[model samples]
Target: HWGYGKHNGPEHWHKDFPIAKGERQSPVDIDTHTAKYDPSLKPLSVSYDQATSLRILNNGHAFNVEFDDSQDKAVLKGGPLDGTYRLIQFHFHWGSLDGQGSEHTVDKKKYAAELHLVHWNTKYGDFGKAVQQPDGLAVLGIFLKVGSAKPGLQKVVDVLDSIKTKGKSADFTNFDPRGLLPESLDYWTYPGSLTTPPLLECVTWIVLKEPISVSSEQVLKFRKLNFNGEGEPEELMVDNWRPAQPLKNRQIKASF
Candidate 1:
C-alpha cells in the first residue's frame, strides 16, 4: 500500500515504516563543498555480463530490470566496498517534468532522473539476507539530464510500452547496463538507506558527479506508466522520488 501519492507518500512512510526516520536514510542533497576528499578511497570497479539481464517489469512503484544473480556473473567492487557485490537489478526514479526528478541532487540542483544499479555483498549469501546487513548493499547512482537521447537508454525506453501497467513484464535480455554509465566515475560516497519503504539503511551509496544525457521525449514515456495495476483507476507514475533527508552524523566523501 506504500506509494508516491499525497496520502501515502514519503512524508507518511515513517508512520508504517519507522525506519523511514532513521539517521542513515538516502537521497541526500550532495553539497559539493562540504564533501571531504578521500585519497585512500580506491576507484570503483564494475563488470557485468550482458547475458545476465533477464526481464523488465513495472512494480507499481518504478520499472525495474532484474538480472540473473544466482552466481557472480556481474559484480561491483572497490570504492568503499569491502568485497564483491553481485548485481541483482537496476531501476529508475523520475518526475513528470524534466527539471526535477533525480533522487540525489548536486549542490541543491535536481536532474531529469536518477538510475540505481543495485548490488548485494557476496559475504551475506543472497540479496534477501544482504539487505539486512549494514554494508551488504551497494548502489551506483547516475543522474540523467535532458539533451540528446542516449543510445544505451533508448533500449530501456523502447520496452516501456510493453510494461505500461503494474505487474507487466517483458523479456529484456543481453542488455549491457555498463553502457549507461557516464565517462567520469568520480562520485560522492555515503552510508545511506533505500529511498523507499522498509527504507533499510544497508546501502553504500556511490553517486556519480557527471550526468548522462537523455532526451525529454524519452522521459515522457516513463510518465506514461501507471502506478495502479490493471482494472484499477489509473494513476500516472510520476514524482516517485523521496525528498532529501537530514545528513545528521553522516559525512559525504568525494573520490575526485
Candidate 2:
C-alpha cells in the first residue's frame, strides 16, 4: 500500500497509480486574490442525522468515521453542488508538528491539520459508481488550528485510544457532523481529484474559509497514532498528507 514515507510516499505514487500524476489532482494552494468571486453561488445546505454514523476505524491510511449512506439520512447540497450528496465517511490529515499539515493551503499557508468529509452523489446510485464520473463526489475540507480546546471533537478523541493501531475499529454513532464545523458556510470551490491514490477526478471541492480550533495538547496526541499494526515496526501516523498540486487551467471560485 502507498504511504507518506520516503519510500512509498506521494512522490512514488504515480508509479503504482498512474492517475496520481493526472491534471485534476487535489490539495491545491488557494490563491485568494486570483480566485474568481461568484455571487450566484448558493449557500451550502448540510444536515447530518447523527444516527447515520455507523462506526470508526483505523484504516492505516487515516482514521475514518464511516456513515450509513444507504439513504439520505445525512446529506450535503447547494453551494457548488448540483444534486444531493450523501455522507459516506469523514477523516483527517495531519503533520508531526504544530504548524504544517493541511493538504489545501490558502496563500501558501499550511494549518495544523485538515478534515475531509466525503460524500457521493445520489444521481450515481453509489459511491463506488460515482467515483468514476466527473460530477461524482463532493469533499468538504475544514482546516484545524491549535488554540482553544475543541469540545466538538471530544467524542472523536475519546475513542482514539481504542483505535491506535491499524485495522482496529469501534462502533461509533450519534455524532453530529454540524458540531465539527465552523460558523461560516463561506468557501472556495474548485474541480479536483482525490488527494490520495486512484486519484479520481470526480470531486467538487468545497473548502471552508474559517478554521476550527483544537488544543495544543490534542494536537500532540495525534502524533501518537501509528501507521502500522500491533506487531510491525511502527511508523508515526503524523504527516499523512499530500503536498499542494498544480492548478493548471482550473478557475477556483469563491462563494462569499
Candidate 3:
C-alpha cells in the first residue's frame, strides 16, 4: 500500500500513480516575487457551520475531520472560484520535527505543518465526480507555525488519544473551522493537484499567506498518532507532506 514509509513515499508514488509526474502537481514552491498579482480576484468567502462536523479519523495517511455536506451548510465561494463549493473534509500534513512539514512552501521556506480544507464544487454533483474535473475541487491550504497554543487547534489535539491507531475514529462535532483560519484571507492561488497519491490535477489551490500558531507541545501530540493498525509494528504519523513540485506552465496568482 502507498504510505510515507521509505519504500512507498512520494519518490515511489509515480510508479503506482502516473499522475504523480503529470503537470499541475501540487505543493509547488511559491516565489513571492514572481507570483503575479491578480487585482480581479475577489476576497475569499468561507461560511462554515459548527454543526456540520461529524467525526475525526486516522485514515492511515493523515487524520481527517469529516463534515456533513448534504447541503450548502459550509461553502467556499469567490476568490478564483465560479460558484459554491461545499466542504467535505479537512486534514493536516506535518513533519516528524518542527522545522518542516508544510506541503506548499513560500520562496522555498517550509513551515511546521499544513492544514487542508477540502471542498468540492456543487456543479459537479458530488465529490466522486468532481475529482475528475479540472475545476471541481478547491482546497484551502493554511500553514501552521509553532508558537503559542492555539485554542482552535487545541480542540483537535484533545481527541488525538482516542484515534491513535490507523482507521480509528471519534465523534468530533461543533467545531467551526473558520476559527482555524488566519485573520487575513490574502492568498496565493494556482492550478494544482492533491499532494497524495492518485495525484489528480483537479484542485484549485488557495494557500493563505499568513500562518496560524500552534504550541510545540500541541505538535508533539499529533506525532503520538500512529500510522499502523493494532498488532502491526508501530509507525508514527509524521512527515506526511509531499515536497514541492515543478511549476511548469502554470502561473501562481496572489490575492493581496
Top-lDDT structure, candidate number: 3
Q: Order of all candidates by lDDT, from best down to worst?
A: 3, 1, 2
Q: 1-256, model 2: which lDDT tens digit per residue?
A: 7899999999999998898878899989999999999999999998875438889999898899999998888899999899899999999999888789999999999999999999999999989999999899999999999999888788888888898999999999788888899999899999999999888899999999999999987777777888999899988899999999999889999998
Query: Per-residue lDDT for 29 in model 3?
Result: 96
lDDT for each residue of candidate 3 in 1-256, tens digit (9 for 90 to 100): 9988889999999999999989899989999999999999999999885338999999999999999998899999999999999999999999999999999999889999999999999999999999999999999999999999888888999999999999899999888898799989999999999899889999999999999999999999999989999789999999999999999999999998
Model 3 lDDT vs. the true structure? 0.94
Query: Lowest-lDDT window of 10 residues in candidate 3?
Result: 45-54
Taking every candidate in turn, the Cα RMSD to the unseen true structure, in Å, is: 0.9, 0.9, 0.8
Overall lDDT per candidate, in order of appearance:
0.93, 0.91, 0.94
lDDT of 1 by residue, 138-235 (tens): 99999999998888888999999999899999999999997899999999999999999889999999999999999889899899999988899989
Comparing 2 and 3 on lDDT, the stronger one: 3
How many clashing residue pairs are found in candidate 3? 0
